[PDB]
Each structure stands twice: as structure tokens, then as C-alpha cells.
Design a binder for this molecule. Structure first.
Ligand SMILES: *[C@@H]1O[C@H](CO[C@@H]2O[C@@H](C)[C@@H](O)[C@@H](O)[C@@H]2O)[C@@H](O)[C@H](O)[C@H]1NC(C)=O
Ligand SMILES: *[C@@H]1O[C@H](CO)[C@@H](O)[C@H](O)[C@H]1NC(C)=O
Lengths: 8, 99, 274
């Protein structure tokens, strides 16, 4: 399962 | 980071006329990512080609595989035609069965 | 041996042509196993390896929702980066991320990583300690500062040390027949004439898994790594890999050159000649 990314 | 694709065409098994096999076109080391890749049998687009194995290297260049089942004959030709912004015109690379 | 779980994520803007293209591709070791592509007609997370049939419908729904959430974050990122770099809205730009973890043969964490690029250049990367980031330019420094104040490294470290490792262990368990196998290389040598009294000898290794392999050419017991041409190891359409390495030698002396193949599926390395 991938990470849940947050905005840069 | 405008990097022109390297285009490699090869079969899974050593070719034997009349024996089913897999033909690959691995398109690598390219940037930007937009690209068009077609596999051709006697100059005609092969239907149902699978795209797989997309990745990037440590320098961020892109890699992707096109592949299809095929049964070679002595005189059918196979090629991979690629369009990318690094090239003015599409580049067509033929399968060299004797490499 | 050790094993890895890696996701390759790409977002590409296309001004005048709608929303960016967004893709995720997952690998366990050298095997593609999941994918998401926003340009599909009804985009969903999809299996790419047979053994992923062992995940039930809830997995596919949850990972699809995650991908859609990720897609939105990268859409916003593309806009934000135009601001950080003072770039116009008319050009196409690319964000790339590699994210994942590696475990040892015993299933314990060896390393985690997450690194970003913008237009093919390093942007920001998690340090090996999983506690801080390193930024390649002043735009990435803004990101670093935001992520520091928001507690992002703690969240990411929890994923890398926990979730990522647990999923990798499960995938290795479910996909054991595929992922823990060894397919031995089969090798051969081809020969090609040249101008001048020289010949090209090309050593091929076919049908192997995993992808790691070493091909060398020797003369008089010495390896010729300098004189060699080779291609990067490449997938062959059925979950196996191939590679070749060549050397140019004098016509009539082909017999003195040997190709050597080392691989996990070769108890003793192969030695072959033309
Ligand atoms: C692989 O492991 C098998 C037992 O594990 C189970 O069946 C596999 C296919 C997964 O569904 C897993 O989650 C289950 O716990 C062994 O029976 C089998 O012999 C192993 N195969 C090989 C090639 O070693
Ligand atoms: C952003 O770019 C424009 C030129 O395209 C310029 O007028 C503006 O001052 C730039 N801003 C900075 C901070 O360099």
C-alpha cells in the first residue's frame, strides 16, 4: 500500500 | 532533461520460425515523459500491445516496456515506432533477430 | 534475501488539455504488481501480478480512494511549484516520486526512502534517518519548512517503519510462489563481423529472475569491463529479465575470450565461448 501524500 | 529515448527491440526466447514467443520494445532513458509507442508487424500496428514496467532511474529518466505475443516467420518484419519531443520525426527501430 | 516495496509516482501537467496525467506504479522487488492511471476510462487501482487476486474488494476500493487523494495533492503541487519557481501556466511540467521500504530476509526494516524530483531534477529527499529532509534548492526549502512545522516527517516515518513494512511482508507471503522463485539464466554467444580484422562477440543471458546479474568477458583470466558494451538489464514481457554484454576482439582469436554469468540461479557461474 502506497503512502497518502500531502501537498508540497 | 530533454533526453532522447533509447529504443531496444528483442524477443523473450531465441526466435524459431513458427514457435510462439514474446516481442518487446523497451523505451528508456527519456524525459519529458510524454511519448507514443507503437509495435508494427509488416508496417501495420499490432493490436492489444501491453504497456508495462514503467519506472525511472536514479537520474529520473523514464523507462517503459511495450510487449506482445508473436509467432515469428522467416520474412515477417517487426518494429517499434516511437514519437517523443526530443525528435522531429518518429523513430522506427526494427527487430534484429540475429543480434 | 532482502526485499523491497517501491512506488513510482508521476504527475504531468498539460496546459490546454485538461487535468494533469497522474500515475502510480508499484513493485515488489523487480515485479510490477499494482497500477493507477488517471487516463484510463474509469480510473481505478488495478492488479498487475496474479497473486494480487488474494486481496478482496475492499483493498481495491481503499487504494483507489488513496490514489485519487494523491492525484489531487499532486495537482495542487504542480500549481504551487509554478509559484515557487515563478514559471508560467503554459508549459508542461513533471513531478516524480519514488517511495518505499526494504526489509531483510527476516522481515525487519533495512531502509526507507522517499524522494521527489521536479522537471527531472532533484527536489527534496527524506534522509536515511527518516527524521529530516534535504532540499536541493530554495523552493524545496519552503517545502521542507512547511513539512517540518506540520509534523510530516513523523507521519512518513510511521508509514515507512510500520505500514510499508507490514504490507511488504504480506505481499511476499501472498506472492511467494512468484516472488521467492529463482529462474536461472540460459546463455549464448553471437558473433558479428566488422571492418578491419575484428569481430564483435555478444554474450546473452535470457530468462532469469530476479533481475540482478553480472555478465563479464575475460581474456587471460582478466575481466575486460572497460572494453565491454552492454545494455541495462531489461524485462522480457513474462516477468523474467535479459541482458547482453559484448566485446570486440581480433579475428581468429575468438577462442581466448570467455563470457562469465553470475546469478542467484547459477550455483556455479556459467563460462562460455563462441
Ligand atoms: C508458497 O506458500 C504456500 C502457503 O502459503 C499460502 O498459500 C499462498 C499461495 C498464499 O496464498 C499465502 O497467503 C498462504 O498462506 C505454500 O503452500 C507453497 O508451497 C509456497 N510455494 C512455493 C513455491 O514455495
Ligand atoms: C517572475 O517573472 C517575471 C518575468 O517573467 C518577472 O517580471 C517577475 O519579477 C519575476 N519575479 C521574480 C521574483 O523574479
Amino acid at each position: 500500500g502506497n503512502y497518502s501524500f500531502y501537498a508540497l | 532533461i530533454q533526453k532522447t529515448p533509447q529504443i531496444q527491440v528483442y524477443s523473450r526466447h531465441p526466435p524459431e520460425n513458427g514457435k510462439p514467443n514474446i516481442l518487446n520494445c523497451y523505451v528508456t532513458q527519456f524525459h519529458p515523459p510524454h511519448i507514443e509507442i507503437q509495435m508494427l508487424k509488416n508496417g501495420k500496428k499490432i493490436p492489444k500491445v501491453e504497456m508495462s514496467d514503467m519506472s525511472f532511474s536514479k537520474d529520473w529518466s523514464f523507462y517503459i516496456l511495450a510487449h506482445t505475443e508473436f509467432t515469428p516467420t522467416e520474412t515477417d518484419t517487426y518494429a517499434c515506432r516511437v514519437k517523443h519531443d526530443s525528435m522531429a520525426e518518429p523513430k522506427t527501430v526494427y527487430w534484429d533477430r540475429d543480434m | 534475501g532482502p526485499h523491497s516495496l517501491r512506488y513510482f509516482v508521476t504527475a504531468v501537467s498539460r496546459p490546454g488539455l485538461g487535468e494533469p496525467r497522474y500515475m502510480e506504479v508499484g513493485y515488489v522487488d523487480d515485479t510490477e504488481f499494482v497500477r493507477f492511471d488517471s487516463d484510463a476510462e474509469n480510473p481505478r487501482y488495478e492488479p498487475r501480478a496474479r497473486w494480487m487476486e488474494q486481496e478482496g474488494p475492499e483493498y481495491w476500493e481503499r487504494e483507489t480512494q488513496k490514489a485519487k487523494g494523491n492525484e489531487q495533492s499532486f495537482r495542487v503541487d504542480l500549481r504551487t511549484l509554478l509559484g515557487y519557481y515563478n514559471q508560467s501556466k503554459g508549459g508542461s511540467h513533471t513531478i516524480q516520486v519514488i517511495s518505499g521500504c526494504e526489509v531483510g530476509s527476516d522481515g525487519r526494516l533495512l531502509r526507507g526512502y522517499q524522494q521527489y524530483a521536479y522537471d527531472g531534477c532533484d527536489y527534496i529527499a527524506l534522509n536515511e534517518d527518516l527524521k529530516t529532509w534535504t532540499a536541493a534548492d530554495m523552493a524545496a526549502l519552503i517545502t521542507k519548512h512547511k513539512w517540518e512545522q506540520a509534523g510530516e516527517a513523523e507521519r512518513l516515518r510511521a508509514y515507512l517503519e510500520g505500514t510499508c513494512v507490514e504490507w511488504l511482508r504480506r505481499y511476499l507471503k501472498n506472492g511467494n510462489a512468484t516472488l521467492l522463485r529463482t529462474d536461472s539464466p540460459k546463455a549464448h554467444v553471437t558473433h558479428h563481423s566488422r571492418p578491419e580484422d575484428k569481430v564483435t562477440l555478444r554474450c546473452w543471458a535470457l530468462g532469469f529472475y530476479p533481475a540482478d546479474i553480472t555478465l563479464t568477458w575475460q581474456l587471460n583470466g582478466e575481466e575486460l569491463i572497460q572494453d565491454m558494451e552492454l545494455v541495462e538489464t531489461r524485462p522480457a514481457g513474462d516477468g523474467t529479465f535479459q541482458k547482453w554484454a559484448s566485446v570486440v576482439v581480433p579475428l581468429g582469436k575468438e577462442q581466448y575470450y570467455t563470457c562469465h554469468v553470475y546469478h542467484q540461479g547459477l550455483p556455479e557461474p556459467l563460462t562460455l565461448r563462441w
